[PDB]
Amino acid sequence: SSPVNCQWDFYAPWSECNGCTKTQTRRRSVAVYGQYGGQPCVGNAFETQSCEPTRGCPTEEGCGERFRCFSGQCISKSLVCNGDSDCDEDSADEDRCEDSERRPSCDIDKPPPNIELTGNGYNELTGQFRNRVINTKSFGGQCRK
Amino acid sequence: NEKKFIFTRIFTKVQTAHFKMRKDDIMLDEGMLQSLMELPDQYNYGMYAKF
Amino acid sequence: AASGTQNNVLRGEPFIRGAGFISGLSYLELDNPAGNKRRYSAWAESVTNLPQVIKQKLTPLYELVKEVPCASVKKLYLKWALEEYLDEFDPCHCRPCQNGGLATVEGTHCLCHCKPYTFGAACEQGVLVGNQAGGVDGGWSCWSSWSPCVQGKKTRSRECNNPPPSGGGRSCVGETTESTQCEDEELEHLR
Amino acid sequence: ISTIQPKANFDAQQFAGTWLLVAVGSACRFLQEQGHRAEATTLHVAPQGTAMAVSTFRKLDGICWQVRQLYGDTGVLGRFLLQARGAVHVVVAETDYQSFAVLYLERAGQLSVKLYARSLPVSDSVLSGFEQRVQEAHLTEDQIFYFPKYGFCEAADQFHVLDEV
Amino acid sequence: NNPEFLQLAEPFWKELSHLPSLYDYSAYRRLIDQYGTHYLQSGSLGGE
Amino acid sequence: LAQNRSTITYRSWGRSLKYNPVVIDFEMQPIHEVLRHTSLGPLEAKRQNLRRALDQYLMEFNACRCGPCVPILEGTSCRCQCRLGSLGAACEADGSWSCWSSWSQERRRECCPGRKVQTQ
Amino acid sequence: STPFDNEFYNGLCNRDRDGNTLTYYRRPWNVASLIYETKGEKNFRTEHY
Amino acid sequence: NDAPVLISQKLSPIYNLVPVKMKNAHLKKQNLERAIEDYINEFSVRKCH
Amino acid sequence: CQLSNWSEWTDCFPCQDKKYRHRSLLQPNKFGGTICSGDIWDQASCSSSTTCCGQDFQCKETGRCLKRHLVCNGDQDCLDGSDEDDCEDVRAIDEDCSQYEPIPGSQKAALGYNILTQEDAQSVYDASYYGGQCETVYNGEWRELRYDSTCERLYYGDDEKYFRKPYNFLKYHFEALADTGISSEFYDN
Amino acid sequence: ADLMQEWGDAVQYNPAIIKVKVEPLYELVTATDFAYSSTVRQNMKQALEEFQKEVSSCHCAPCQGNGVPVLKGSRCDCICPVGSQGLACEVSYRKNTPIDGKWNCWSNWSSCSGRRKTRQRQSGPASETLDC
Amino acid sequence: NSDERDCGRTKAVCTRKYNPIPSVQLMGNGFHFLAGEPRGEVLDNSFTGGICKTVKSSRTSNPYRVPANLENVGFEVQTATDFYKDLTSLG
Amino acid sequence: EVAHYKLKPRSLMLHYEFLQRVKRLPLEYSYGEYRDLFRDFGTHYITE
Amino acid sequence: PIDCELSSWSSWTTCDPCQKKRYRYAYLLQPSQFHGEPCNFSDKEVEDCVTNRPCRSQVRCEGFVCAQTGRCVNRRLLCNGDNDCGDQSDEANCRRIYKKCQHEMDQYWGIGSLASGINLFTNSFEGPVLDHRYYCS
Numbered sequence A: 001s002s003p004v005n006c007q008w009d010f011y012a013p014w015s016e017c018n019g020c021t022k023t024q025t026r027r028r029s030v031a032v033y034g035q036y037g038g039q040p041c042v043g044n045a046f047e048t049q050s051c052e053p054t055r056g057c058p059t060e061e062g063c064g065e066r067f068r069c070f071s072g073q074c075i076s077k078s079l080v081c082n083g084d085s086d087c088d089e090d091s092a093d094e095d096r097c098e099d100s101e102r103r104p105s106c107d108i109d110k111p112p113p114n115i116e117l118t119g120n121g122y123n124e125l126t127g128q129f130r131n132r133v134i135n136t137k138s139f140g141g142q143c144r145k
Numbered sequence B: 001n002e003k004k005f006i007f008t009r010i011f012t013k014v015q016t017a018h019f020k021m022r023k024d025d026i027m028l029d030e031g032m033l034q035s036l037m038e039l040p041d042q043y044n045y046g047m048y049a050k051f
Numbered sequence C: 001a002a003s004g005t006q007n008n009v010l011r012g013e014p015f016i017r018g019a020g021f022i023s024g025l026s027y028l029e030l031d032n033p034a035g036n037k038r039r040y041s042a043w044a045e046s047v048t049n050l051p052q053v054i055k056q057k058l059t060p061l062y063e064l065v066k067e068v069p070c071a072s073v074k075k076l077y078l079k080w081a082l083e084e085y086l087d088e089f090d091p092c093h094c095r096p097c098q099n100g101g102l103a104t105v106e107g108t109h110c111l112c113h114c115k116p117y118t119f120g121a122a123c124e125q126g127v128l129v130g131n132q133a134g135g136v137d138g139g140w141s142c143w144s145s146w147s148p149c150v151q152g153k154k155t156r157s158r159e160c161n162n163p164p165p166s167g168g169g170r171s172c173v174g175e176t177t178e179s180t181q182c183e184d185e186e187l188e189h190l191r
Numbered sequence D: 001i002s003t004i005q006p007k008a009n010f011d012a013q014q015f016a017g018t019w020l021l022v023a024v025g026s027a028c029r030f031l032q033e034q035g036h037r038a039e040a041t042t043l044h045v046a047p048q049g050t051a052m053a054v055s056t057f058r059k060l061d062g063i064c065w066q067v068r069q070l071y072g073d074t075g076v077l078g079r080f081l082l083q084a085r086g087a088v089h090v091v092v093a094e095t096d097y098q099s100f101a102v103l104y105l106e107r108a109g110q111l112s113v114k115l116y117a118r119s120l121p122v123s124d125s126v127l128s129g130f131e132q133r134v135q136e137a138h139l140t141e142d143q144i145f146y147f148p149k150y151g152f153c154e155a156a157d158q159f160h161v162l163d164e165v
Numbered sequence E: 001n002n003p004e005f006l007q008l009a010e011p012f013w014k015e016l017s018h019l020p021s022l023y024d025y026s027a028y029r030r031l032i033d034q035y036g037t038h039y040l041q042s043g044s045l046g047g048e
Numbered sequence F: 001l002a003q004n005r006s007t008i009t010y011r012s013w014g015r016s017l018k019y020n021p022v023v024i025d026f027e028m029q030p031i032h033e034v035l036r037h038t039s040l041g042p043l044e045a046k047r048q049n050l051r052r053a054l055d056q057y058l059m060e061f062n063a064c065r066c067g068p069c070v071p072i073l074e075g076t077s078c079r080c081q082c083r084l085g086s087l088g089a090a091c092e093a094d095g096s097w098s099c100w101s102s103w104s105q106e107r108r109r110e111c112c113p114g115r116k117v118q119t120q
Numbered sequence G: 001s002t003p004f005d006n007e008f009y010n011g012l013c014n015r016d017r018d019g020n021t022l023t024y025y026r027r028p029w030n031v032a033s034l035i036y037e038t039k040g041e042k043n044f045r046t047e048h049y
Numbered sequence H: 001n002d003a004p005v006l007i008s009q010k011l012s013p014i015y016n017l018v019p020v021k022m023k024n025a026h027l028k029k030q031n032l033e034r035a036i037e038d039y040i041n042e043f044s045v046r047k048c049h
Numbered sequence I: 001c002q003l004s005n006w007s008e009w010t011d012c013f014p015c016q017d018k019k020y021r022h023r024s025l026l027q028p029n030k031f032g033g034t035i036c037s038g039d040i041w042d043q044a045s046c047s048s049s050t051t052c053c054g055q056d057f058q059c060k061e062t063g064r065c066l067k068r069h070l071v072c073n074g075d076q077d078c079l080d081g082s083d084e085d086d087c088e089d090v091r092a093i094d095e096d097c098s099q100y101e102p103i104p105g106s107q108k109a110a111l112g113y114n115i116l117t118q119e120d121a122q123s124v125y126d127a128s129y130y131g132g133q134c135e136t137v138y139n140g141e142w143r144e145l146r147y148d149s150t151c152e153r154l155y156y157g158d159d160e161k162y163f164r165k166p167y168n169f170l171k172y173h174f175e176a177l178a179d180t181g182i183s184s185e186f187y188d189n
Numbered sequence J: 001a002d003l004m005q006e007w008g009d010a011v012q013y014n015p016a017i018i019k020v021k022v023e024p025l026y027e028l029v030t031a032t033d034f035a036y037s038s039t040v041r042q043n044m045k046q047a048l049e050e051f052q053k054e055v056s057s058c059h060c061a062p063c064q065g066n067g068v069p070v071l072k073g074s075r076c077d078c079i080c081p082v083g084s085q086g087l088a089c090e091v092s093y094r095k096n097t098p099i100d101g102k103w104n105c106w107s108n109w110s111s112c113s114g115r116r117k118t119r120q121r122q123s124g125p126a127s128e129t130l131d132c
Numbered sequence K: 001n002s003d004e005r006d007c008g009r010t011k012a013v014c015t016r017k018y019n020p021i022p023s024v025q026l027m028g029n030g031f032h033f034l035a036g037e038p039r040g041e042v043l044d045n046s047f048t049g050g051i052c053k054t055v056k057s058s059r060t061s062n063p064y065r066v067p068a069n070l071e072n073v074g075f076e077v078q079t080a081t082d083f084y085k086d087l088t089s090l091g
Numbered sequence L: 001e002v003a004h005y006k007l008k009p010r011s012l013m014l015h016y017e018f019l020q021r022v023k024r025l026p027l028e029y030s031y032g033e034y035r036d037l038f039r040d041f042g043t044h045y046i047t048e
Numbered sequence M: 001p002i003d004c005e006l007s008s009w010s011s012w013t014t015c016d017p018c019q020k021k022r023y024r025y026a027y028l029l030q031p032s033q034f035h036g037e038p039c040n041f042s043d044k045e046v047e048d049c050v051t052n053r054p055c056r057s058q059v060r061c062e063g064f065v066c067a068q069t070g071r072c073v074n075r076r077l078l079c080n081g082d083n084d085c086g087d088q089s090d091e092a093n094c095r096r097i098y099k100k101c102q103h104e105m106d107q108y109w110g111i112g113s114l115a116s117g118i119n120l121f122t123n124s125f126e127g128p129v130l131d132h133r134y135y136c137s
């Protein structure tokens, strides 16, 4: 057979930068892919250089009447001191929930075994699962036995 | 004439752990440090051989 | 003068996807083609005790962008980025593989996934055990330059290519051309 | 801490043989959260002086295991001691020599009952007496857990054995 | 179900927030590589 | 388990290895290489002196200087402990390396794997 | 037997935390180190003529 | 494990074990060196028939 | 055995307070030569003593350079004990670290090695020096067995499963690999 | 054997890594934790380049008996398949054993005149190029 | 737990804790006639309305807890059959 | 294959020994200390 | 015949203002093999300097500065029954403790190996690069 080494054309024209970390997005397209166990490639795909910020950076989202967590996942204030994975990310705030009344979690112990695998991302061209996207470990206070 | 020779060598090694020693800022034993302090700056085969 | 030749090669590759019990069915394939009933029941109990969430339906991931700073703009840009990701390394770029092999793209390298009981560089050797009908199927070509948004329609025009139907296999299934509505910068960034 | 009267004139020789654990009434974490995964537990009794050599067979993930223990005598006929945080007091109060056996175990100020039988099925009168005793032992009916009636291990191997003794 | 205020994961939400306002294929490419292209809506979990 | 030949002893062998793990193999570096990596700082003079002393020690107490039979030089006594024959004191082609010659710089050897030339 | 005193120790107890069972031993200052390498092997041979 | 015994033994001279900075440490050390040198050559199989 | 003459006496040391001399080993016992009980090393008493770190802190008798943040911390860094002495009004946290056991075998890793005799020399590294650091690695040998008859609970080696890493050790990197290779070659002629 | 389930559930406690997705070390150094982030990252990238050039493992002498050279510090050991003993594995109980070809060290880059690397297979790839 | 948040006193509606009906949630799901897979959950099968109504199965002494959404529960288990046989011979 | 592992994409906590060693790293290009760092902690880390 | 040989000493670099030291190094040219003479000396040299140049050695921290490790741990992780600021510099002078799990969940099986650095060029494992400590869902 005839081996084929990769050969990419020049990168696409320059783009704008507005993330306060100005870096010209210069993407390229590999016009010829490798085959028959040849050389995969030599050069990197992306190239980030100096850029002139023109548009203003987007400010953070408004956390209105919501208890802010260590990450920033703003949820309703009713979840404070619920005796469970309220924020579902970390237990930073915790509302100093020492006296947890109203029977937290109603003695429900075990969740589904690996529901995180179903909640995890999925790729179609590779057939391999990806990272978790939907946080199913949360409960919202409504215990469903 | 008949000759038969066999070498049935079976070597088995089970790696319990793989350790790596640090390279910088190594704290030596007090005895070795004393011995190093007891070495003169002039070349002396006896003390160095003892060490 | 008498000469006799004996040659018999039997190989098995069980796939038991029961975390610990998965290896039992794979190891039991040595000299035992038929699966053990008790071992099969144990593996079934293990699979009951541990889910296999694979084989489920999918949805566009970019739809989950609901409440974030610049939510709609980020969702539209993720739409465009997913389109570019899908068409930048689509299997159309790779050359067709021999013996009906399926090609994939891992970075900047094509890989001809060979059918079972086959091997080789481009799935050419080991055609002893096919167990299939045979032939050469059709493969969709890479999408051409997108439409210039004359009236909003699309101009993909996916047509046949260098792997035509030759061995009597079925042609590439799907639409020949596509039609949509140009976003017009997504309604000038949402009104 | 409680103490009752053991079986009158308990004979370890006539008590030897193969026993089958049927029901256990107590309040333990493994019994209440992991009680649904209980399996068939059989017992082997062998006299050794005043003490009692004890072997236990149970299916763990399919593979059987042999738990060998030695119930040390407490100086009183009927009561025994076993050592591992805690002290175990084995007390046999009501039992015959042919059909059933009831054992009492104490650990960390907590009482527990164990029902043993020579073979299946278990007589309804024996189960009624066991229920009456476990109710008189300040234990509720919900704390009773039934075990499967099949899947008992024949014998373990040298590699799969316990050495508590 | 898909349509709701589904509680997103901390890394997912963080990477979605770190995306620049202006169109930049660089960050979105790494995001699509790390997280994939689709998420599950419904279906059984039968083994193979 | 050494005299044993069955896999029944492998479980107890692994258990003993868990309790008392022996050292199978290990990488090594000269003793004067660790003095440079001390908190005391520069020790170039002492390091070179100890390096020369070690170079002389590896020659005065070399395995060749010991009596030919595996020759093991320990202190002032020469032993091989056998030649697997158990015939005589040393348990008597064979092959034997000659010792390193004096620094000329040249350095000669004679009989054979290994190097026979060294330069100071 | 021992020609010297092997019980005296200089300062802070140097731990010898090793062995088959869970027990802590001491190492005297007279001895540099005492490892617990529990090696074991055997040999065999046969001769005929 | 209850009562072991020696298998391998590293060698070391006694005159090297003499305490330093004693009354006559050096001369007594050299004297014991000469004494052991004469001892190991005084009587042995080499001198017998 | 042939031994050279005694070398000249070196200069006396104030702290060592001893003299030193040595000789070279010319020819050992090759086949049947008379062995030499005499060694190549010697020492001598001396009475010519004259005068006997600079960092934050230093041990009294040993020249171990220690920082002041390790003084009065509930851990003996000097063999003499000059770091935990007179610490009257000083709180000493337990760190929940001295309760766990160090890695078994640090003694052999702290010993020297001689390629000539393949034997173990004296201690080179300090196997008991922590320097206030508390690193714990998931033990691999805490997996023997654990049973509970009263609750019919059979579980794993969860009791006392932690190995404290003795500053001088970079990492222990627990791992496991067992490769049994049998090389059998039966020949018949 | 029949204890495959025991090996499987023991691996659940102490598993071994097979597939790895690597990420350079200078990306792990963040600006919020260390000052001079840009200079540190540039120096780390240059050091990684020099290291990859140094430990490329091609500078070791070619082994024999289809061995695979392995670089470790200053020593180089040859990993040989079953059937060969001794250093460099020149002794074996087999005739005309097929020796697999190995690639040599890639040449240095040209000064912006068109970067190309050369290498001789004395089955590794070669003829790598980078635009200036 | 909004109703039972800070109740100073409660009236025991059921004397003993009973187990729920197994697979009772399958009869609360919605049914999409077009899709052939019925639907996700729409009705709640854990709510009981306070009344501790139960039913005793055959040789299943431990009582089951009937939800409030189920008006009538009956245990009439009975099997209901296909058989195929083919044989060909050639000589 | 027993378990799937994935490191957080950003905002991770660094080890204290590596923290101190990076704080000890110089600013001027010195291949010695960087090579020692590569020999002590490797060339990459584990993301997946 | 192929004994180890290191290149010549590199040119002296400028004295680092922050590290108050100058550095020089050498790189390997030929590896030793067949029990040859290795390169049994340091591949780098360090010397003391007298640098007068303002350096930004110390880094700022918003949260509480840990007493032993010097970590920028937020106050939300203090007095929670967890060991966050290092060995024991956290949990100091705490009135009450909370926010800890009751079942005392252990760490992931084998997570220690997945937190250490790896050498992709030699496939060897190295020291820990990530902090896989406890820090509860």
Ligand SMILES: *[C@@H]1O[C@H](CO)[C@@H](O)[C@H](O)[C@H]1NC(C)=O
Binding pocket: K072, K073, K074, K076
């Ligand atoms: C369904 O429930 C009804 C309730 O009366 C019962 O009569 C019937 O036997 C059950 N089973 C069926 C209809 O298959």
